[PDB]
Design a protein around this nucleic acid. Sequence first.
RNA 1: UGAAGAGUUUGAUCAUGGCUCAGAUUGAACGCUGGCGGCAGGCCUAACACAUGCAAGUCGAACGGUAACAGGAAGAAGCUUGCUUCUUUGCUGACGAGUGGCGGACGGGUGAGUAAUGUCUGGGAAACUGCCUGAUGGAGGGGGAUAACUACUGGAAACGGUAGCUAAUACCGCAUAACGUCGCAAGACCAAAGAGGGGGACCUUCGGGCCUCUUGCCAUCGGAUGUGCCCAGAUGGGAUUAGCUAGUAGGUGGGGUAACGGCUCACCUAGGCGACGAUCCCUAGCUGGUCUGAGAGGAUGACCAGCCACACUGGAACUGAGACACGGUCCAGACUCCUACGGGAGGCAGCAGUGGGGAAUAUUGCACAAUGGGCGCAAGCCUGAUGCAGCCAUGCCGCGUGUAUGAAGAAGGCCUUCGGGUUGUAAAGUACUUUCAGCGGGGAGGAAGGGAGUAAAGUUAAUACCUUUGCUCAUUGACGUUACCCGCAGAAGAAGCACCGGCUAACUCCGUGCCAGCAGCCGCGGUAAUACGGAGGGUGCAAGCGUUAAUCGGAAUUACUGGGCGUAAAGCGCACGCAGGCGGUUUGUUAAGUCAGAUGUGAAAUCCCCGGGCUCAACCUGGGAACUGCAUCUGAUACUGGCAA
Lengths: 85, 205, 80, 80
Amino acid sequence: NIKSAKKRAIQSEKARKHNASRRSMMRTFIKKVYAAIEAGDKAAAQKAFNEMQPIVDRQAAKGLIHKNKAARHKANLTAQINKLA
Amino acid sequence: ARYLGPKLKLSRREGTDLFLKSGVRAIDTKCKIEQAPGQHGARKPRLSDYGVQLREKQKVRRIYGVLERQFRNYYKEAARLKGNTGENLLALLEGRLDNVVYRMGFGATRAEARQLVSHKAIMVNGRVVNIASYQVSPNDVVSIREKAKKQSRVKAALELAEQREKPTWLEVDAGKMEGTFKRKPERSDLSADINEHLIVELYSK
Amino acid sequence: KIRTLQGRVVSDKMEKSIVVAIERFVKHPIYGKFIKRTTKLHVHDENNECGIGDVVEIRECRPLSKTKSWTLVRVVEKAV
Amino acid sequence: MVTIRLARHGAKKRPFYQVVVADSRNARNGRFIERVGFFNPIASEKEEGTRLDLDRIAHWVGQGATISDRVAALIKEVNK
RNA sequence: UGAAGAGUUUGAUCAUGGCUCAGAUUGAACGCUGGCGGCAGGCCUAACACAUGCAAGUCGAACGGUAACAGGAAGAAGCUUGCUUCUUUGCUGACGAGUGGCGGACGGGUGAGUAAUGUCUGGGAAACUGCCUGAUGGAGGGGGAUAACUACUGGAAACGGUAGCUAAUACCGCAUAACGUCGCAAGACCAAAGAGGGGGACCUUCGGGCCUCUUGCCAUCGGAUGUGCCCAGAUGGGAUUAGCUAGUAGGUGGGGUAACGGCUCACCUAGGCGACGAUCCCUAGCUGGUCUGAGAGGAUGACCAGCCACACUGGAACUGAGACACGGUCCAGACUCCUACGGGAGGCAGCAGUGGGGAAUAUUGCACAAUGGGCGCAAGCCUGAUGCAGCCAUGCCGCGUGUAUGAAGAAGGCCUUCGGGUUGUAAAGUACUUUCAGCGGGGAGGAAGGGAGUAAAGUUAAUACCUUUGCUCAUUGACGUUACCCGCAGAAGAAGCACCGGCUAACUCCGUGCCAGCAGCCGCGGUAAUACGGAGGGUGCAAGCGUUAAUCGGAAUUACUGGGCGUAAAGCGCACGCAGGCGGUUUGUUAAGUCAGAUGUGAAAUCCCCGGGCUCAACCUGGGAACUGCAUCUGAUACUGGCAA
């Protein structure tokens, strides 16, 4: 209304829909692995694991996995394929 | 209040003088003293218990000029010390500046002793005061100032000073208008009209 | 060292969980008389096998399920 | 956040300051971590109105926490 | 160093038992009265609604820049001529706006909600933590943008839309890849930001590269600090509240959080909880503490400190280490306001003010001096935090309003066989003093710092710079001619309020006449009232006094300390018995209860013990003890309990 930097609100409009896309690109790739898990495949679940492996990693370096989730969330999705193996 | 009224009329029904306009006069000299201060708003009889019990409480109270509060407070320091409660109280009561000066001959009247300290003519040590209560202690120095070895009121109270024994626990110097309060009071010899046991019963609930 | 707390099973049915009642001497405050003020806590057995009166050792830790913070550390004895 | 700071505890028109390590999210009169000192700006002669330690103004300033200008200038004049 | 009772039932009396008073207290109110000053406190209610003003910014040392101000230069004018005047130019001071970073998540206020995985005490384990700080290592090379700006163009404003351009410590790749992370392993995979000062040798198309320093940046592993999360125990009242529960209880496997968890789900089992009081109902922010009180206890939660919760109502999410951000956003809703009538805007439980409520609670004041807080590598700027001032006897404390002397003792009253008594040394009258107010005149101190120069004994360039050190110089004071101090006249300008029948100290004379009225209780008054009214007098307190309300005390009259039950208040009409409480006697064992010791902890504040500092005191303050307690660690075995015989 008056704020010193009420522009802060507009600035965050940018940084909330940037984040958004990066995360939802990451969520479409998790859906692509899961495809192959119901096919029994190690050849399309793994065209979607090592291909989101730099993804997942570089987005922890944008801090967008966050904190101790980001020391956890390269093991959480490792977990997946191992059941099937 | 500091009173400001008819001193000697009190004497009548006090049954004692306790230093009301001492300098030439005392009981039954140019005044009517030892009566009742009423026509028959008050006249002599057998007395009630409770009369006495209030009066004596005020006896001790009035010969220092202490208010309601103060003297009770002194009691709350006495019954906080693990020494003698009776002693302690009368010890604290004599720490008042006004009482000390009278007993260095400065003022012929108790009221006058306290009416000195008022006008700027008193001091203690190099400190100037105009406060009628102070912390008075062993090896203090009671000091008159410049323009108080000039007043003709002060000198005129040394008269009576030659006529009162003056305490032995203070040095007293009138020749340079000093004296030190070198050591603690004795009350081995002032409790001669003071029964501490009476008042401390009453104060107790 | 560690702390393990003497409870007595008194309700075992459910799989992998034993209900224990722990009786400690609580004193009254104003009237200074000790009493049994029993207090259930929900202990997780590794495999349920208990019942009633089984002195056990429990200890404080992380939860594993809701209303947990307790484990079985040893069965002192049994009485089922 | 915690900082070395001064902290009035004087009454009205009495500047008695106490050097505290205290919070900036509570206050200088609010939540203390600890005392560490006393200071007179008026340089009173009362019993221990100046203290400033050696041991905690050499340990919480180890992991960082800054002092004040009078203090800075006092380190030298107690020749610590 | 530690606690006392009195009056009041009755013709009289002794018990029993209620009633009342004397105490201490308050964010208190009221009535009357009102000299000063120091210290503290001051909307408790309608968390009702609010005009306005202020309370939330700052870095140019990341930027692209130049809107204003002022110079520098530049051409020029006037030749208003070597001095005035005009245009140009980001060059330089300096800075509008706009991009970028950090604060606005704090501080402040309020107690409405709230019987609480909320608070308090005591532990615990599976976590986070920007600002902070240690260590080691790094900061390589590219790209795409877009604000401002610009040209248009829409609205009354709010507030827009086109089209074009561009910067970065902004954005996104790419490279490099551990003491990294993930992965049993084999392996796989991920980072960036520079900006400043200065400079000798060189180079430059002369902007700079080179070099040296400095701050900032990136990573990895720690530490600090601060913060999530769990548990146990203590936390209010009502059974004219007895039955409760479906992510309910639990188990698998999924998913989610920073992390542990039905936090959430799919499936599976059908459990779980309850009278040691569930469920429900009433009421309440909680704590250190506070008040009172001999203590125990009860009551209580004002200022001050900590915790928690809330910000028009309701709901919701974003960025981030941090927010559901009081003065951020959005949505819905009721309010409220404006309008160009198309449409918009707003939320004082922030400060100061406003109106309404209420018994009652203050000024839209001054200021960055000082203390602290924020931004910034600095300078510097910002602050209803704060320091001050103001208003209010709301309270605590100090001092004063004069001292002396003065009698037949003055009139003037009042009472009086009318001898006088009382007011009364009181006055008059005499000297003696000017505190404090008032007037005139000085005036300490609260200031350390930063700023201009100089020394380096660092670092490098040997010099710079930067930081460091002392010195040198001009100064930093809002309060306010401050504390205080000197002089100046002149008792001058400075007392009131209640009460006097008994509890309870303190009466006479009149007027009134169970009327008037009085009254905490017991009770007063029927025409000779120590109780009503006036006067006179007397009494207690005193710049206050008295009244009320309110809480504890007395009241051991709810009683653990510390109570009764034949008849005073109280024993079920009488048995049986489940839960509960309780257990003869001897031995062995255990050590849970219990006893001992040890160790943490028991916030600051507060009490006390000892002890100081303000002209005293109020007030300020140091150190010790207390911190009764709790958990933990180790022993003891008499008693209590368990077990065994």
